């Protein structure tokens, strides 16, 4: 549609290093931010999961021993048959 239009642009802007905000109104303007002023801020590493999909923990153990996931927050994101989406933060814990 005119809805493939926005995808191609969004992807190209992403590939070029920009950040997109307020880009959910398909029919409206969106915002395009230079990456460099923003990227060094705290952020999530986010992941799209169908709610029934199994998330292989083998990668989360590689992260654990190589010290790769320590100061990081991973964001699990799943939309429900509700229409809503549910969010779980996942952080390495020292104990």
């Amino acid at each position: 549609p005119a809805h493939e239009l926005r995808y191609s642009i969004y992807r190209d802007l992403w590939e070029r290093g920009f950040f997109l905000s307020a880009a959910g109104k398909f029919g409206g303007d969106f915002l395009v931010y230079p990456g460099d002023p923003l990227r060094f801020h705290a952020h999530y590493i986010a992941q799209c999961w169908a709610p029934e999909d199994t998330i292989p923990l083998q990668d989360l153990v590689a992260a654990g021993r190589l010290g790769t996931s320590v100061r990081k927050t991973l964001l699990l994101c799943s939309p429900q048959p509700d229409g809503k989406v549910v969010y779980t933060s996942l952080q390495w814990a020292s104990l």
Partner: protein, 127 residues
Amino acid sequence: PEDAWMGTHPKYLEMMELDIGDATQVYVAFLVYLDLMESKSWHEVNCVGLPELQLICLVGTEIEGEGLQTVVPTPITASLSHNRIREILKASRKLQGDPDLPMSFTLAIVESDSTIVYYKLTDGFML
């Protein structure tokens, strides 16, 4: 194999008597119990059976007087859906006694070599 002696331990037998899980599940729950009491200095660790979820979890006070945390021992090869995680979050809140923090539990992932990696899972957006 090299660990058949753990079947004698009273907290192993307590976990096994929950009649939840196979030997790998009971074993990794027991391994996490030992780690929390010896490799950390946890005050108390209690085991609790959630048979609806067919999960054993450990509920404990990391420090005396401090609130309770839920630790969910899991082999490296288990299957975890996001939906399953949400159900563990909801059950974890009941075991913690519906406080005021957002739902969270600790997932204790156990590799075949018995290394354990701990991850805190919390409802929503943390950092």
